[PDB]
Amino acid sequence: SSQIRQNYSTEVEAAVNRLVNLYLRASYTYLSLGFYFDRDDVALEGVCHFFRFLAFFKLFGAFRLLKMQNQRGGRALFQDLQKPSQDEWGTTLDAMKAAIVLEKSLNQALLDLHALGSAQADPHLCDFLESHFLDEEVKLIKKMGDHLTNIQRLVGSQAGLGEYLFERLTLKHD
Amino acid sequence: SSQIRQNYSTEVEAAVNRLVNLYLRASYTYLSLGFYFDRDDVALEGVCHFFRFLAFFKLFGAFRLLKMQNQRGGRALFQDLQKPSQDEWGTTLDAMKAAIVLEKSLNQALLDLHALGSAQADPHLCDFLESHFLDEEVKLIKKMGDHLTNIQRLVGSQAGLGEYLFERLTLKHD
Amino acid sequence: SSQIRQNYSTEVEAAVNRLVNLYLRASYTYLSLGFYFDRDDVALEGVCHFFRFLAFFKLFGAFRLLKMQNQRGGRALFQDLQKPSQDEWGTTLDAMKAAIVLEKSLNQALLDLHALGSAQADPHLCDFLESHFLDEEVKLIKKMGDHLTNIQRLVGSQAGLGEYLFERLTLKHD
Amino acid sequence: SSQIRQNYSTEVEAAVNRLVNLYLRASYTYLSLGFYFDRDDVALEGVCHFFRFLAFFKLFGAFRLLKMQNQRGGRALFQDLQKPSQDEWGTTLDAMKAAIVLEKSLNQALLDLHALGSAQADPHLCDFLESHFLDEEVKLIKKMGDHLTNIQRLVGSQAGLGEYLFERLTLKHD
Amino acid sequence: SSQIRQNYSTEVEAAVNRLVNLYLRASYTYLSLGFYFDRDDVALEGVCHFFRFLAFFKLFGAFRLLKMQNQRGGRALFQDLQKPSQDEWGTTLDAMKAAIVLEKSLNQALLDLHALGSAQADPHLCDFLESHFLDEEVKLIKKMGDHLTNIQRLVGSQAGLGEYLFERLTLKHD
Amino acid sequence: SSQIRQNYSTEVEAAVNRLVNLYLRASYTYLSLGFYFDRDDVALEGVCHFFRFLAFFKLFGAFRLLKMQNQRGGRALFQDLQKPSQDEWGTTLDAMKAAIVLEKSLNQALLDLHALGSAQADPHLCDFLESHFLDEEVKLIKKMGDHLTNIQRLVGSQAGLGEYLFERLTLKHD
Ligand SMILES: [Cl-]
Ligand SMILES: [Cl-]
Ligand SMILES: [Cl-]
Ligand SMILES: [Cl-]
Ligand SMILES: [Cl-]
Ligand SMILES: [Cl-]
């Protein structure tokens, strides 16, 4: 058996591998969102940059989970990565709504893994999630909600104007 | 009796304590305004920051009054602090109108205390208000009036657009 | 309903608002303690400065709770703030005893909210309290206990001398 | 139709999307290789670092292809990403042999796309591959070959010793 | 009774004192390991330095526990410290195996104390262990496991050569 | 036999190991003294810091003896470490008296080992003690005596006042 593994259940080990898959899927979704907004017929640079940053952020989350798996003596196992749910992502509003749905799904997965760790009396797992994931996720969802509200406020009956303004005046661009 | 107190009436001492209560109430109102605009379903960061700054500014006014009370040999007495008049503050326009009403009420209290000090031939009190409160208050009310006019100009028939623009282009934010 | 709220019970939301009230009440108590020790007939600058710092520290705790409430998608609700329990605070010893009673009450409220969050399987709440409140509170209570012991040691039968010495040689002043 | 697209065939557009998939698959393979060598029961840090760097390098190649797709007015389309060919990667020698097989497959795909672009008289495509991919790939394969030879030289009849030495003295580590 | 103690059970207080004893025993074990590898007839400086660093690290853990005991209002109680389990520690491999056994025993003690704190609804205790001990322990055990694997790889049939190489090329020395 | 050992008797080797035990016991005593003075119900920071520094100083003495044992080709042997003589240490005066008794016992052990080395014509041993231990010990005992006199002077009939003053004005603290 493993020479380091201690207090690390097979259930947690498997759920960690599933969570890695979810984060890599999310990263891939954000890559697709970013390149959609980079299209010449969409052309919203600040939106492209927002989602490209999230793609990297989710990849980093996957890396941290994988590092932790090895630190605990579990075995990282990779599965196929499903493609994103859409090929074209509609408006900034559509995209931000899809992103918050995605993040709520990741958050629920975090909460489920935390509950499993608590049930298994695995405090290292619980602390790892609390310290590196739960607050970052709450912060991100709050940000997305703030953005949704500002996007929604700007729709009015001049949708194109509002979409431009949001990208120019809220999102970070050159 | 007090070893330092000189030319400091009981009427002024009491009115100073009442004024502290008014400034702390105002500070609390601004705390509530700030956190309303921080809500994910309101999300106007520059508005949040404007009112949070005013919360601190009013707290500082209360501190100065309390310092002065002690310098004069009066006794600081604290009363319960009433909660703010609203739990939800409507639009930026609604909020800025409530703020200017609040400030006019504080200004009238300043003017009333100055008149009491003048009647009591308390020039230190009168100078203290003139030097640290009256002009700061006039400056703040002017600023708020300038803001009200710009907000009103932006309502038109695209209210959400104007509310965004004001927050982005007039108020200070990240 | 809220677009961000997830795993955030009404019970926790209410208890957070109650806790904000408790921290603001504590802040107000410390404001009163500070200005008492600033009186010309009390005149213990290091004691004034100790309690003024705590007033700010408790205000900051309230701010953090309110920020968290919004991050979670709860609604900040403010209530009236009761005045402090005393108008005059006796000796440094009396004041430090009142402060430790106050802090033990805040600590119990923290522990109660943590237990509620644990019962509700709200790990973000539990981590927030652990990371920003519980240890800070334990550290503060320990400090106060250290101070109480030194004050008590100095009473002897030369109380005024000991009260001066403590203020001069332990507490931070100009 | 597209407002920018010019001299950009559907065949090239599709082959670019396929190539993105191949690079992302390669990146994923290298992520798996890296975490295998990070296991406590493998523990070859320089090998872990070599493959983690390649994972990032292949991701960057995919990003460049996607940027180019948009610059040309094609549509980035993402497909499912197959998991890597192995869950456990054997020795450093096994791993480096798998890596060179992978890279030769990527190189052939590059050469095939270049031939398609040449047949289609698409010089921008051909120059893009020549300038950003072909030489980088030749350089990488040469490096891997150099490594294979040194690993092979070190097998002898003291395989563990040689595997350690290679990791310590050729590969970059802390 | 104690003037600060709150929510701090006698069971936790005792278990903290036992844990201090375990950490000091571990520190003493590492002192002995370090001086064994410093012998002229062993002479593995990097091994000496590894274990001397761990001796200090475990002493620091004991200090932190003792600081916490006082912060909580418990009473630090010291017991006799048993000598280390061996006078001579064999090979680097033998020593590293003894060290990982020691660390797994310390980790189990940490986990047991965390479970007691959880049962006692002592979140400060649980957070203290999570924040300052559990991850540091997992990190250390992983490191030791990595070392064991590299040592084992180097045994082959040239044990002395491999032991030298490990000390020279993995462990930190002058 | 040992390849380096020369002019190093078994008697000296054993006495060196006994002396290490005495220094580690002294270090442990000082750890206990330090944490006693850190208690919230004792709270004499300068006293805590004095004894914590001595704990480290005695540990360093043990390290030097162990280094020397190996340099001479003797074998370091560790025994159980007895717990300190008291769980609670009374007043600063009580504690400083216990410390000087402890140091006189260590000094006598140094003098006894020096006499053994002289009898055995072991000048390296004698020089080692003279150069690194004897004067440091005389200096420390003198310091402790100076402290005892100042503590005793301050008892008078206001013991608590004097104990505070000594800690504040002689001992080093924040
Ligand atoms: Cl498959
Ligand atoms: Cl009342
Ligand atoms: Cl009310
Ligand atoms: Cl599909
Ligand atoms: Cl005993
Ligand atoms: Cl024994």
Author numbering:
A (entry chain A), B (entry chain A), C (entry chain A), D (entry chain A), E (entry chain A), F (entry chain A): 1 to 174
Show sentences the authors wrote.
As a scaffold for aromatic cluster design, we chose ferritin as a protein cage platform with a 12 nm outer diameter and an 8 nm inner cavity, composed of 24 subunits. To prove this concept through protein engineering, we focused on a two‐fold symmetric inter‐subunit interface of a recombinant horse spleen apo‐L ferritin (Fr) as a target region for mutagenesis. Herein, we present the construction of an aromatic cluster with an artificial molecular binding pocket at the two‐fold symmetric interface of ferritin and explore its ligand‐binding characteristics. We developed a system that uses ligand binding as a driving force to induce and propagate changes in the orientation of multiple aromatic side chains.
To modulate the shape of the central pocket, we prepared Fr‐F5/59A (Fr‐E53F/E56F/E57F/R59A/E60F/E63F) and Fr‐F5/59L (Fr‐E53F/E56F/E57F/R59L/E60F/E63F) in which residue 59 was replaced with Ala or Leu (lower). Conversely, in Fr‐F5/59L, the introduction of leucine (Leu) imposes steric hindrance, effectively obstructing the pocket's entrance. These variances in pocket morphology among the variants are anticipated to impact ligand binding affinity and specificity. Replacing Phe59 with Ala or Leu significantly reduced the incorporation amount of NR (1.4 molecules for Fr‐F5/59A and 0.4 molecules for Fr‐F5/59L). In contrast, no electron density attributable to NR was observed in the difference Fourier map analysis of NR•Fr‐F5/59L, likely due to the entrance being blocked by L59 (distance between L59–L59' 4.1 Å), preventing NR entry due to steric hindrance.
